[PDB]
Amino acid sequence: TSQVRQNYHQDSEAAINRQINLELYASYVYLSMSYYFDRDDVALKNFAKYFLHQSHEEREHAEKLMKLQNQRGGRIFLQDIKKPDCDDWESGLNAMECALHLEKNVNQSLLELHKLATDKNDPHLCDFIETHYLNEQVKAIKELGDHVTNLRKMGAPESGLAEYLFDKHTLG
């Protein structure tokens, strides 16, 4: 047993390892989306920049969970990072809709994690999730919702002009 471990349930330790994998997966999804918009037949550079930034932020999320695992005396257990569901993302609107779906899935996982930490009476872990993850997810979901709304109202995905101008004015 770790000399630092205190009030840290084995189930919570396992759930944190699963969350680490999911954050790394989200980083990979955003990396894929980013370079889709870097293709010469898509060519929306601020979509590409926006999703690359999101990819780096997910890697930071994963690193913070790994730090937490060690802080609490759990042991990190890594699994394969699955490739994203799509190779081709269709349009800026469809990529934003996929990102919204991804972030709501990550939020569900975090809420299940919080439920477990509550059930195991682990207030440090509850506070860690609330401080570093839950409002970040709410802000990310709201931003992506805003983006989807604007792209739809502007006429995407049929209007390539709409995605071009959104790239310049909102993401630029």
Interface with Pt ion in residues 65-124 (CB under 5 A):
98
Residue list 58-117, contact with Mg ion (CB under 5 A): 58, 61
Residues 103-132 that bind its own copies (CB under 8 A): 104, 107-108, 111, 114-115, 118, 121, 123-124, 126-131
Per the annotation, does 90 bind a ligand? no
Does position 11 interact with its own copies (CB under 8 A)? The reply is no
Nearest distance in Å: CB 14, Cl ion: 4
SS3 of residue 161 by DSSP: helix
Tallying the residues shown for the chain, one arrives at: 172
Using CB under 8 A as the criterion, what x/- string covers residues 71-110 for binding its own copies? Answer: xxx-xxxxxxxxxx--x------------x---x--xx--
The minimum distance between CB 86 and Pt ion, in angstroms, equals 6
Q: Which two tokens stand for residue 148?
A: 């989807």
Residues 6+ positions from 78 with CB-CB distance below 8 Å: 17, 20, 21
Per-residue 3-state assignment (H helix, E strand, C coil) for 85-138 = CCCCCCCHHHHHHHHHHHHHHHHHHHHHHHHHHHHCCCHHHHHHHHHHHHHHHH
Cβ–Cβ under 8 Å, residues 47 and 92? yes
What is the distance between the alpha carbons of residues 30 and 27, in angstroms, rounded to a whole number?
Answer: 5
Confirm whether residue 112 is marked as ligand binding.
Answer: no
Flag whether 63 is marked binding.
Answer: no
Binding site, residues?
A: 23, 58, 61, 103, 137
Binding site for Mg ion (CB under 5 A): 23, 54, 57-58, 61, 140
- Which segments are annotated as binding site for Fe cation? 23, 58, 61, 103, 137
